[PDB]
Amino acid sequence: MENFQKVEKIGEGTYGVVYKARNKLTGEVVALKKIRLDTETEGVPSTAIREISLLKELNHPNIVKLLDVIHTENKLYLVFEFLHQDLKKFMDASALTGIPLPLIKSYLFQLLQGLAFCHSHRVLHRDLKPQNLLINTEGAIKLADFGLARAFVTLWYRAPEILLGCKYYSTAVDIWSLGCIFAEMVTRRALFPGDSEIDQLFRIFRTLGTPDEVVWPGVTSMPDYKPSFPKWARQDFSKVVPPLDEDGRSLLSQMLHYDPNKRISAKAALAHPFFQDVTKPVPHLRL
Numbered sequence: 330m331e332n333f334q335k336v337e338k339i340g341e342g343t344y345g346v347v348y349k350a351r352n353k354l355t356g357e358v359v360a361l362k363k364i365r366l367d368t369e370t371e372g373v374p375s376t377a378i379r380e381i382s383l384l385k386e387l388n389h390p391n392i393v394k395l396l397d398v399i400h401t402e403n404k405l406y407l408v409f410e411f412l413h414q415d416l417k418k419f420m421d422a423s424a425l426t427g428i429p430l431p432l433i434k435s436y437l438f439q440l441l442q443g444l445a446f447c448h449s450h451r452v453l454h455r456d457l458k459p460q461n462l463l464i465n466t467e468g469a470i471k472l473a474d475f476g477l478a479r480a481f482v483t484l485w486y487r488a489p490e491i492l493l494g495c496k497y498y499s500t501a502v503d504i505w506s507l508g509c510i511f512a513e514m515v516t517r518r519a520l521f522p523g524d525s526e527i528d529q530l531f532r533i534f535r536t537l538g539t540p541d542e543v544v545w546p547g548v549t550s551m552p553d554y555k556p557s558f559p560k561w562a563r564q565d566f567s568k569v570v571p572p573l574d575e576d577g578r579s580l581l582s583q584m585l586h587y588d589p590n591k592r593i594s595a596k597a598a599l600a601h602p603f604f605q606d607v608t609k610p611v612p613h614l615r616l
């Protein structure tokens with residue numbers, strides 16, 4: 330798009346290449362996403378245009394704002410509000426001291442408000458990860474790449490129902506991913522760092538126990554469930570996320586329920602006692 334000047338490659342994500350750009354008209358600095366070029370053959374599917382157009386209306390302070398959608402030269406460009414840092418870089422920068430618990434809590438609470446909004450509109454993220462969570466100097470955290478999955482790789486934050494081949498998975502998949510991110514902020518280590526789908530599944534089973542019909546009715550009927558799966562016993566949360574307090578552990582336990590129907594919703598998670606003393610601290614950001 331001739332109305333923009335590329336400043337730097339922000340990165341090469343899942344939906345193409347992302348650039349920091351300046352809008353030659355308004356002077357605004359934005360994030361520009363080129364949705365497929367070497368893979369894109371035709372002139373963008375009609376149903377993809379309509380789903381992206383619906384996303385431009387999904388406006389919330391905890392969602393990276395989609396400013397514009399440019400369908401020109403039969404290619405697709407998404408213009409997003411720009412944020413200077415992501416949670417992965419912030420966690421890497423904070424690994425020696427750890428993110429202070431009040432900021433972890435503020436980030437978790439805001440992302441749960443973001444998810445509550447999306448979920449009320451029947452919109453799922455489906456691929457939540459530290460790299461997709463954008464932060465600013467004012468203490469805000471925002472969901473980026475929201476709803477792009479139905480419009481058109483790291484397995485660490487994948488819900489078990491996805492790994493077991495459930496085709497019609499729900500909003501509970503985002504709650505699972507956010508619980509994994511919560512555990513990671515607390516411990517300064519990924520909860521389930523799998524490098525294959527089976528390794529991902531087996532790491533979940535080693536910590537939370539191999540699921541069965543007792544904890545998850547219908548699990549043995551899942552597409553990729555195998556009766557030959559090894560049977561591991563569950564481990565206590567006190568071993569999984571020390572030194573997280575009991576309110577935090579209780580909330581995490583509910584975000585990591587096997588059964589998607591028992592997993593806490595974003596709305597109910599916001600009422601959890603863990604957020605009784607939530608505040609909005611400001612991070613130490615070196616840009």
Ligand SMILES: C[C@H](C(=O)Nc1ncc(SCc2ncc(C(C)(C)C)o2)s1)c1ccccc1
Pocket residue numbers: 338339340341342343347349360361362393409410411412413414415460461463473474
């Ligand atoms: C972390 C930050 C950054 O990515 N800022 C940004 N602001 C707004 C943005 S569009 C949302 C989005 N689409 C795709 C993404 C990635 C690939 C980064 C996950 O994110 S992406 C940054 C990275 C590298 C250099 C400067 C800024």
